[PDB]
């Protein structure tokens, strides 16, 4: 909650040439984060992200063996946000977007989940947001990206061709195989006048004119793209040249973010 | 068909009949999200507790002019066991029973009458679960409440005891809880008075006092560990600041 | 309003009478109320009276399908919904409140989880057809102790019920009319009975927590006036084989463990007498029905 | 279900360019309504929308109005809850930019859309978005709610774009699947559809007085 | 990675995969390591100083003989430790 | 199998003073049995069947196995069709083609099982089987 004078001051600062952010960041600069992985021994993979303003997210990865003819989608995401109802609009919108970005053909290599000519692994992604102060789409995306690159799966040791004669799948009791799937990343941008901002803060979201959601995968922009309202009292229309600017910005500065999440 | 208690006096994980599991706790883990917080590890259990308040009530209906209102919320995740849960546990009768039991336990211990016209909220997240979860919940709530600087009379400690034929076993895990009946206790301070007593399966009438005594001694040891951790944290906090 | 108001004079008077070993209705601290049980015309229709508390129960069954996970068992469910008939302090639809949830859980653990009913005898065809049994409890008038009255009523109704005889004819089944082939009863493995205790503090909280003496007070089967002023409550379920079916003390006033064991030992003498009374009443009802049927020949 | 008659538990379900027409104000117990009906070679759609408000709202004082949008199936249940709610959120984002919400303190506006008819005469929910926008605009104008401009939309190869100010501004952008390098063509095609829809909407408002 | 807890008592982790009828599940267990396991030999004089009673308060008994069977040179006075296949067959 | 004084069972026995009294107690083309995974897969799909086997002393080249899905026992005929099996063993059987009944895919074997079920009632041709796995001995 901000007053009229605060909002006017902040908007005058942000919508200037050059733009002035309240903490002095550059238009493309991110804030520091802390990453932990592999701290839930009962899961195939896990991660925890802590933001500088107190935001925190926890991700768990679990698997199951299914018949990949009856089963159509091998990736499923479930989202829980503390303080919100299970049928809240924002929760279901985020769930839908995250299931769309990890669909079968999106840049996610689902051929690595196949065991035997009949069966496959199905991956369950569980997300729990402990504390948040703005739209937590990119934080959840970063946590999912971190957790999926440190996941291990059971190793099959019982035949591969079972079209004619089928045997129950059987797995080695100690060894596991690292999953080398290619996960995407999701970015959120803010529109303040004629400027574009990367990784906006809570107070910057209260004065923004509009927002954009852009997906990224292995060097290219990916299909799920949306316009989103970050507030309800200042949302307005924008000219078409700001969309191209945002796409170019994501294309230019995405590779640096990838190197920050390595290991 | 397994050797729950071997003729040599050893359990399946290598413990003896009167030994606790590994006990680790942390205080002030979420400074930016709550007034008081704690992180509890008891064996393979992992619990996060947050305490918010005392603060202004959300609605004018939930206001009391003589004392504060206390609320407890418990969230059990779908990935807390080996097998993923099919549906949510938010509105089950078991969870509501747990929340009511915790509220009624801690109503008598917290001095709610010195915070009129306020509300205190407790939110709990269970990440991993390996038996004896109620005692862990009690211990986490106690630690988080003390970390928030809220007045109370004494500690409350939780413990679980299983009865295997004629042998009492202290601080059981998931394997033992699926093969015998268990008792859960809540003990106040260093006395013999019980705040909670919970028996859910059959137990012979002439075998309950011994179980109660064993559990009381175990809870005293648990209280000692919690007090030592709290004193160490306070010493570190005051030494430099 | 929906709030029951108690003045300071009434609270002081009742507590001071408890200090002098007095109860308003003239019972002693360890005396249980008298129980009256009446059977209706149909099987499974029972009325239970405990002083001023009145409870009614009904048992019924029908054909259903077994669960996929458990294809060798039938279905059993218990419903206890309260209405403003028993008192204007009760809401019509309220199954989430604290006391209702606690009562439902205690009854479920005492009856259905303990395996007092043989659900494997409810299976007709393994994996496809079974019996589904219901117990409906109606609360008519509240003077305290719904849990004990409900437990007694449910057990008596289950022991009074009879279901129609059936036969398997190839793929389908035939349900015979009652006037043809003599309906059959259910199998009962044990008879659990609940007892409730109430605790009062005649001192302050400091004496209860840091004091050396243990001067707390315990009474059995409190009335409505008594249970509105209590500090704690305990429920214990037992059977005649000296088994503790369940124990529930969910917070409240802290109590010394020896006193709790003494309460558990006092409950057994009551449950024995209650079990004998129920068995005798059932036997007398059966004899009356047989005599009338013989006289109607 | 204690409130519905759903029948026996063991039963199983049986297993086996565009020309428009616009009309407003035909529902008696609401404030505004519209009927949109579009036909082409290989598709046919009918829609009904209704507006309730401004009305009283529960809670504390608010200085500006609040908008709620509800989408419902019709005849055939062809969509599930999650996608309908996502489309509702997108529409609410669009219409928070065109309604003069500062004019309606401590009040609410509720909008209902019924998906009556949709038949294939010869990626499926995206092509339905423009007609929803047209219907909501018409119903809001019929009910007498203040709008800064007339909002329309167009669809081209899985991309939906909504325009105001004669196609010089964007109030909504949606993109699923499709080609990654096709952005200018989609914008041109969507704007071309938007201009025709805007002409038809203005004619409908001006004629049916 | 093991941790020393209180009295020379350490704990580790035990992870394996269970194969049911078509399913794969990983199991995590905790594993405690002690330092009071007696050799149970009647000739020993330092193990009887580390034993503790059981739940029924009974001390362990020492069984193995102090003068076992003597073979020829160069072994003499031996004990026998068995193997899985020898026991099974 | 293959410091520490390591000796095999034979080597250790010869060191004993009474080796000659206990040395005789030392522990001493049929088709191969199917693998456990193969047997379990066949059992789950309904291809393979399990039951007791009874063999009489008058004829050692024939046996009978009772199966829940069949009204009458299935015959097993042959010195090779009967694997190395004793009386009262728990075995796993597999049906034989109609061209071998007494006077390579799961769907075909289900069809064969249906044929055997429909031929048991009246047709005077007895379906035959063979042993591919020993469950208990």
Curated annotation (Swiss-Prot), chain A:
GO molecular function: mRNA 3'-UTR AU-rich region binding
SUPFAM superfamilies: Ribosomal protein S5 domain 2-like (SSF54211)
Biological process terms in GO annotation: exonucleolytic trimming to generate mature 3'-end of 5.8S rRNA from tricistronic rRNA transcript (SSU-rRNA, 5.8S rRNA, LSU-rRNA); nuclear mRNA surveillance; nuclear polyadenylation-dependent rRNA catabolic process; RNA catabolic process; RNA processing; rRNA catabolic process; TRAMP-dependent tRNA surveillance pathway; U1 snRNA 3'-end processing
Highest taxon listed in the record's lineage: Eukaryota
Family: Belongs to the RNase PH family.
Subunit structure: Component of the RNA exosome complex. Specifically part of the catalytically inactive RNA exosome core complex (Exo-9) which may associate with the catalytic subunits RRP6 and DIS3 in cytoplasmic- and nuclear-specific RNA exosome complex forms. Exo-9 is formed by a hexameric base ring of RNase PH domain-containing subunits and a cap ring consisting of CSL4, RRP4 and RRP40.
Misc. comment: Present with 7110 molecules/cell in log phase SD medium.
Protein name, per record: Exosome complex component RRP42
Gene: RRP42
Curated annotation (Swiss-Prot), chain B:
Family: Belongs to the RNase PH family.
A Pfam family assignment: RNase_PH_C
GO annotation, biological process: exonucleolytic trimming to generate mature 3'-end of 5.8S rRNA from tricistronic rRNA transcript (SSU-rRNA, 5.8S rRNA, LSU-rRNA); nuclear mRNA surveillance; nuclear polyadenylation-dependent CUT catabolic process; nuclear-transcribed mRNA catabolic process; nuclear-transcribed mRNA catabolic process, 3'-5' exonucleolytic nonsense-mediated decay; poly(A)-dependent snoRNA 3'-end processing; RNA catabolic process; RNA processing
GO MF terms held by the record: RNA binding
Subunit structure: Component of the RNA exosome complex. Specifically part of the catalytically inactive RNA exosome core complex (Exo-9) which may associate with the catalytic subunits RRP6 and DIS3 in cytoplasmic- and nuclear-specific RNA exosome complex forms. Exo-9 is formed by a hexameric base ring of RNase PH domain-containing subunits and a cap ring consisting of CSL4, RRP4 and RRP40.
Keyword RNA-binding belongs to the record: yes
InterPro entries documented for this protein: ExoRNase_PH_dom1, ExoRNase_PH_dom2, ExoRNase_PH_dom2_sf, PNPase/RNase_PH_dom_sf, Ribosomal_Su5_D2-typ_SF, RNase_PH
Gene3D superfamilies (alphabetical): GHMP Kinase, N-terminal domain
Alphabetical list of CDD domains matching this protein: RNase_PH_RRP41
Cytoplasm in keyword set: yes
Chief location bin: cytoplasm
Taxonomic superkingdom: Eukaryota
Signal peptide annotation: none
Organism: Saccharomyces cerevisiae (strain ATCC 204508 / S288c)
Keyword field: Cytoplasm, Exosome, Nucleus, RNA-binding, rRNA processing
Protein name in UniProt: Exosome complex component SKI6
Compartments where found: Cytoplasm; Nucleus, Nucleolus
UniProtKB/Swiss-Prot annotation, chain C:
Molecular function, one GO term: mRNA 3'-UTR AU-rich region binding
Gene Ontology BP terms: exonucleolytic trimming to generate mature 3'-end of 5.8S rRNA from tricistronic rRNA transcript (SSU-rRNA, 5.8S rRNA, LSU-rRNA); nuclear mRNA surveillance; nuclear polyadenylation-dependent rRNA catabolic process; RNA catabolic process; RNA processing; rRNA catabolic process; TRAMP-dependent tRNA surveillance pathway; U1 snRNA 3'-end processing
SUPFAM superfamilies: Ribonuclease PH domain 2-like, Ribosomal protein S5 domain 2-like
InterPro entries, sorted: ExoRNase_PH_dom1, ExoRNase_PH_dom2, ExoRNase_PH_dom2_sf, Exosome_comp_Rrp42_subfam, PNPase/RNase_PH_dom_sf, Ribosomal_Su5_D2-typ_SF, Rrp45
Alphabetized UniProt keyword annotations: Cytoplasm, Exosome, Nucleus, RNA-binding, rRNA processing
Subunit structure: Component of the RNA exosome complex. Specifically part of the catalytically inactive RNA exosome core complex (Exo-9) which may associate with the catalytic subunits RRP6 and DIS3 in cytoplasmic- and nuclear-specific RNA exosome complex forms. Exo-9 is formed by a hexameric base ring of RNase PH domain-containing subunits and a cap ring consisting of CSL4, RRP4 and RRP40. Interacts with LRP1.
Protein name in UniProt: Exosome complex component RRP45
UniProtKB/Swiss-Prot annotation, chain D:
Location in the cell: Cytoplasm; Nucleus, Nucleolus
Main subcellular location of this protein, as a coarse class: cytoplasm
Pfam families recorded: RNase_PH (PF01138)
Keywords assigned by UniProt, alphabetized: Cytoplasm, Exosome, Nucleus, RNA-binding, rRNA processing
Keyword Cell membrane applies: no
Any one GO molecular function term: RNA binding
Keyword Nucleus (UniProt): yes
GO CC annotations, alphabetized: cytoplasmic exosome (RNase complex); exosome (RNase complex); nuclear exosome (RNase complex); nucleolus; nucleus
Record-linked Gene3D superfamilies: GHMP Kinase, N-terminal domain
Domain of life: Eukaryota
InterPro entries referenced in this protein's UniProt entry, alphabetically: ExoRNase_PH_dom1, PNPase/RNase_PH_dom_sf, Ribosomal_Su5_D2-typ_SF, RNase_PH
GO biological process: exonucleolytic trimming to generate mature 3'-end of 5.8S rRNA from tricistronic rRNA transcript (SSU-rRNA, 5.8S rRNA, LSU-rRNA); nuclear mRNA surveillance; nuclear polyadenylation-dependent CUT catabolic process; nuclear polyadenylation-dependent rRNA catabolic process; poly(A)-dependent snoRNA 3'-end processing; RNA catabolic process; RNA processing; rRNA catabolic process
Other information: Present with 7380 molecules/cell in log phase SD medium.
Record note on quaternary structure: Component of the RNA exosome complex. Specifically part of the catalytically inactive RNA exosome core complex (Exo-9) may associate with the catalytic subunits RRP6 and DIS3 in cytoplasmic- and nuclear-specific RNA exosome complex forms. Exo-9 is formed by a hexameric base ring of RNase PH domain-containing subunits and a cap ring consisting of CSL4, RRP4 and RRP40.
Family recorded in the similarity comment: Belongs to the RNase PH family.
Protein name from the UniProt record: Exosome complex component MTR3
